[PDB]
Amino acid sequence: VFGVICKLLDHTCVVSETLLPFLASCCYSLLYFLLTIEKGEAEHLRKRDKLWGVCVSILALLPRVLRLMLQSLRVNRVGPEELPVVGQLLRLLLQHAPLRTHMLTNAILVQQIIKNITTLKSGSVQEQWLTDLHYCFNVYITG
Amino acid sequence: NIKDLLSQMHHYNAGVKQSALLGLKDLLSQYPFIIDAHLSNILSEVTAVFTDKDANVRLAAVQLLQFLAPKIRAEQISPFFPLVSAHLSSAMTHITE
């Protein structure tokens, strides 16, 4: 289904507002699958690039779903078990140059989450994945 | 950061820039990832004039180009080749030797 909307959009599209909240919820959860591969089952490893390619293209074509997806991705309602997963995704979407200007318009939304991740993880260990998070945001784009 | 250094390059004072180029090469040497993040802007500023009024300013720019050349390897630099040659051609075809 992600492929159809990626291969059907035109300037005359009248994309409904009742489908965008559905698409954003379906996109991150599929994105969650890619990150928690953790090897294990060898079957669920080859089907990674195909899902990743179609998943990324849906945000580039729809500016609004990216804001909708990042309007719900927050903390203080999920335990720290999923914190490495969301931290990896947020820093990864800052890469993939096709999606620079899309994230530039949503700088405020991303910035608020950045402080939240640092907030609860105050007294802890370095957590290299968090150290890269602050620098990559300032390095790959302006602060 | 880089955006601070980019502002230091366009400043009116020539001596202000001199501190920027020396600090610039150190920054990308520490982090090669600075290269690909904003390739378009870095090339534009250094190649903007290509003809300063003080000799060492170009030398600092040349040494920056000496250091910056190994990292960038085609594709991205390809379409601003007319751009750099534009400043190049004007400087080669100029009254002052």
Side-chain angles (χ1 to χ4, degrees):
Chain A
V1 152
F2 271 11
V4 154
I5 312 182
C6 278
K7 242 171 182 187
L8 223 68
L9 266 158
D10 227 327
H11 37 296
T12 166
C13 212
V14 178
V15 191
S16 313
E17 310 67 20
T18 202
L19 209 65
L20 290 201
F22 158 79
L23 271 163
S25 297
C26 167
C27 199
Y28 163 61
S29 266
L30 171 60
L31 219 298
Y32 183 92
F33 155 66
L34 281 173
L35 302 187
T36 178
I37 38 182
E38 70 204 2
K39 278 223 153 48
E41 332 92 322
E43 295 268 53
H44 314 341
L45 288 164
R46 186 169 289 112
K47 43 139 94 176
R48 166 190 210 282
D49 39 353
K50 307 168 163 292
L51 279 163
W52 170 253
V54 314
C55 214
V56 151
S57 302
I58 207 58
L59 320 92
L61 271 81
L62 282 297
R64 197 149 42 236
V65 61
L66 181 53
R67 185 161 262 281
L68 255 298
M69 201 205 278
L70 267 303
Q71 219 150 35
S72 93
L73 257 71
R74 77 199 176 274
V75 214
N76 310 105
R77 56 167 186 168
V78 164
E81 45 268 35
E82 291 199 327
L83 254 287
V85 202
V86 47
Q88 195 155 355
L89 150 73
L90 220 32
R91 93 165 190 77
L92 198 290
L93 278 205
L94 260 205
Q95 326 266 314
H96 220 278
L99 313 93
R100 298 326 300 295
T101 78
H102 280 325
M103 196 96 70
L104 266 151
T105 326
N106 309 331
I108 274 177
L109 244 184
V110 181
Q111 279 256 40
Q112 204 270 335
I113 314 162
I114 288 294
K115 334 282 171 183
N116 275 109
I117 302 193
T118 324
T119 300
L120 68 185
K121 319 209 86 163
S122 310
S124 188
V125 315
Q126 259 323 295
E127 308 183 28
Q128 157 291 335
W129 66 250
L130 175 76
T131 81
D132 195 8
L133 174 90
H134 307 100
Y135 219 166
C136 76
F137 177 48
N138 291 319
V139 153
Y140 213 119
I141 220 70
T142 205
Chain B
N1 281 335
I2 298 95
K3 204 80 72 202
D4 318 61
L5 290 148
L6 298 160
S7 48
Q8 302 273 340
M9 291 305 188
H10 206 337
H11 223 169
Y12 296 93
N13 183 213
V16 156
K17 314 159 173 330
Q18 316 304 104
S19 41
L21 313 106
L22 314 157
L24 204 32
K25 321 147 167 49
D26 161 72
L27 165 158
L28 300 81
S29 63
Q30 296 165 308
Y31 314 88
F33 331 93
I34 308 298
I35 287 279
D36 48 45
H38 33 288
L39 271 183
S40 51
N41 330 113
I42 326 188
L43 181 144
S44 311
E45 311 221 356
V46 73
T47 55
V49 68
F50 261 137
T51 163
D52 312 305
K53 270 53 192 185
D54 187 21
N56 62 3
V57 191
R58 265 144 312 207
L59 162 68
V62 164
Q63 301 158 292
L64 172 61
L65 221 167
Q66 287 301 62
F67 160 82
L68 156 54
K71 264 71 69 180
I72 47 193
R73 194 257 328 175
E75 321 100 36
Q76 175 66 95
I77 193 171
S78 151
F80 333 103
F81 215 85
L83 166 77
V84 47
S85 62
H87 333 289
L88 221 39
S89 34
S90 34
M92 310 175 58
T93 72
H94 171 52
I95 301 98
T96 278
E97 304 89 63

